């Protein structure tokens, strides 16, 4: 039995209504007790999946009434009424007629208004430089939506391929993201150049924001 979930991801503002679909390739309705062997799980970031609904429409203990499961046979729906910021999670459906199957999940993100990042640049530490490698770090703080670009420049020379980025989960309160970009240089290359800069773009920025430092100043 195959499970198809749609949409794969969506962003919805707090207070609005959410509907997500789970369709099975075969009926999971058991004729003997007239129950659908379908459940819904909520998996918040960093946590294990938590059971929300079983028998397609029965809420697990503790689950608030704003979560409603519906459908029968092959077509099922999870509705979240007046979404709250704590409802950010990936929602999975699960059929358990005999063997088990899981859907591909619907990632629920919290939509909010656009916020441009604040930018900070960090030189490599003197301690790290004693080791032959230099890490330059730029921080992009409290922005939305998730997409952003960090362009590293070394004496105005555009860098490529020697950076890695990492993005936080949405903040539990304000739903923003933060991002760290790390530029990795040999110590030899780092001490050969003076001006280190990270140039940041984001859909909320009318023009790029650049933060920079001069080595040894």
């Amino acid at each position: 039995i195959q499970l198809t979930q749609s949409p794969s991801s969506l962003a919805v503002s707090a207070g609005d209504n959410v509907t997500m679909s789970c369709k099975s390739s075969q009926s999971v309705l058991y004729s003997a007790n007239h129950k659908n062997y379908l459940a819904w799980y909520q998996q918040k970031p960093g946590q294990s999946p938590k059971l929300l609904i079983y028998w397609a429409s029965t809420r697990e203990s503790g689950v608030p009434d704003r979560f409603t499961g519906s459908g029968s046979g092959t077509d099922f729906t999870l509705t979240i009424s007046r979404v709250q910021v704590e409802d950010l999670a990936i929602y999975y459906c699960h059929q358990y007629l005999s063997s088990w199957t899981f859907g591909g999940g619907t990632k629920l993100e919290i939509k909010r208004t656009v916020a441009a990042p604040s930018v900070f640049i960090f030189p490599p530490s003197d301690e790290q430089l004693k080791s032959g490698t230099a890490s330059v770090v730029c921080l992009l703080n409290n922005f939305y939506p998730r997409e952003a670009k960090v362009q590293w420049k070394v004496d105005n020379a555009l860098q490529s391929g020697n950076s890695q980025e990492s993005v936080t989960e949405q903040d539990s309160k304000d739903s923003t993201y933060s991002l760290s970009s790390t530029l990795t240089l040999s110590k030899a290359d780092y001490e050969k150049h003076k001006v280190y800069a990270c140039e940041v773009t984001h859909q909320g920025l009318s023009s790029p924001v650049t933060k920079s430092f001069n080595r040894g100043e």
Partner: protein, 208 residues
């Protein structure tokens, strides 16, 4: 009812690993015991189940050569062995079973498959109206590390980023916090780093 799974697992490629799921609070042979794989970009995937009453096993076709499920009635413990390990087998694994009004899941066992060997991080300061400061937690294996600030007295504005896997096979992450610039001369800022696999503990003062 409790499903207690064994601790985190680390393996070199090509080897095998065996994890356990200890059941308590019910008759072990009365319910099938399922196993589930959770890999970052692969959602949740059912592996298979064992019927502990008779040792019969049923597998997801994708795992028929990867997983071997066994059970020990006397100790109320189920086992899953994963063989011919590759980095594709790195994931969180659960055991689970169903009940009349709920499902019971184990707490999960994390498996990392890599040619890397356990190694503690190096911790470097990220030096600073608003100032940012942080700590670079570089070149450690395996995950995870934990970072706190001022022994937990500082939480607001802290961002500890997900680790990135470097080309060396080692992980690196940064933890940052934003504070008033006017506080830098009156308040100490210390990142508390813990890497339990290597027993590494580092508490670094971060100053301009």
């Amino acid at each position: 009812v409790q499903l207690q799974q064994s601790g985190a697992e680390l393996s070199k490629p090509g080897a095998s690993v065996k994890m356990s799921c200890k059941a308590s609070g019910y008759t072990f042979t009365s319910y099938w015991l399922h196993w589930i794989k959770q890999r970052p970009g692969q959602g949740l995937e059912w592996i298979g189940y064992i019927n502990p009453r008779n040792d019969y096993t049923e597998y997801n076709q994708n795992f028929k050569d990867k997983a071997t499920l066994t059970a020990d009635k006397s100790s109320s413990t189920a086992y899953m062995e994963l063989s011919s390990l590759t980095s594709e087998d790195s994931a969180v694994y659960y055991c689970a079973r169903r009940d009349i009004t709920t499902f019971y899941w184990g707490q999960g066992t994390t498996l990392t498959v890599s040619s890397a060997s356990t190694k503690g991080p190096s911790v470097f300061p990220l030096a600073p109206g608003t100032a940012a400061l942080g700590c670079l937690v570089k070149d450690y294996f395996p995950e995870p590390v934990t970072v706190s600030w001022n022994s937990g007295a500082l939480t607001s504005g802290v961002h500890t980023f997900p680790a990135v896997l470097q080309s060396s096979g080692l992980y690196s992450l940064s933890s940052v916090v934003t504070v008033p610039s006017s506080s830098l001369g009156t308040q100490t800022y210390i990142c508390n780093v813990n890497h339990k696999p290597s027993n590494t503990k580092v508490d670094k003062r971060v100053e301009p």
